[PDB]
Amino acid sequence: GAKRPRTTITAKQLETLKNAYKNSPKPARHVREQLSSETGLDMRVVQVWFQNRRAKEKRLK
Amino acid sequence: RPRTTITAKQLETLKNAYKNSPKPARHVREQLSSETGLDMRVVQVWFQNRRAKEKRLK
DNA sequence: ACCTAATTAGGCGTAATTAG
DNA sequence: CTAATTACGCCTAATTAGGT
């Protein structure tokens, strides 16, 4: 345990992620690193986001 | 329990803050809360009750 | 009687957590 | 990792207790 509150993403970081979601919806470490760098977000947030998007796109349909 | 008071000046800063952003993000609420000196509850509540007033007549 | 600022219970997205 | 669930934050609108 080490505190983990919500973030809120903004259309910009979102758009950047969505743009990065194409090309590779399952990015390895480096790609997530530079995405974190481009966005400022914590790695885990990028990761959990991508997980969630994969889940979302598979969710339907 | 308060009824945590308002003061003119803070409220001045506040309607001044109302412009540019009808309903802001936590950054705004924070720095605003700092300039005011009251808890985020206090800020969000006023913003809310203003959110339930501007439309009340409009 | 006004003013307003606090709950109060409810619904909505979706990030974060958990099961598996 | 996936697939399902939970928790949070973020907003509403109708009360609920204040104040000069």
Swiss-Prot record, chain B:
Looking at the UniProt entry, the stretches that span the membrane are: none
Q: What does this protein do?
A: May play a critical role in the development of respiratory control mechanisms and in the normal growth and maturation of the lung. Binds preferentially to methylated DNA.
| Protein name as catalogued | LIM/homeobox protein Lhx4
Q: Gene that codes for this?
A: LHX4
Highest taxon, organism lineage: Eukaryota
Starting at the broadest rank, the lineage of the source organism is: Eukaryota, Metazoa, Chordata, Craniata, Vertebrata
Region (Interaction with DNA) residue ranges read 3-23
Give the location in the cell: Nucleus
**Could you say which residues of the full protein are shown?**
159 to 216 of 390
Q: Where is this region: Interaction with 5-mCpG DNA?
A: 41-53
Q: Which disease is it linked to?
A: Pituitary hormone deficiency, combined, 4: Combined pituitary hormone deficiency is defined as the impaired production of growth hormone and one or more of the other five anterior pituitary hormones. CPHD4 is characterized by complete or partial deficiencies of growth hormone, thyroid-stimulating hormone, luteinizing hormone, follicle stimulating hormone and adrenocorticotropic hormone. Clinical features include short stature, cerebellar defects, and small sella turcica.
Start-end of DNA-binding region:
1-58
Provide the effect of residue 52 to P. Answer: In CPHD4; the mutant protein is inactive in DNA binding and pituitary gene activation assays
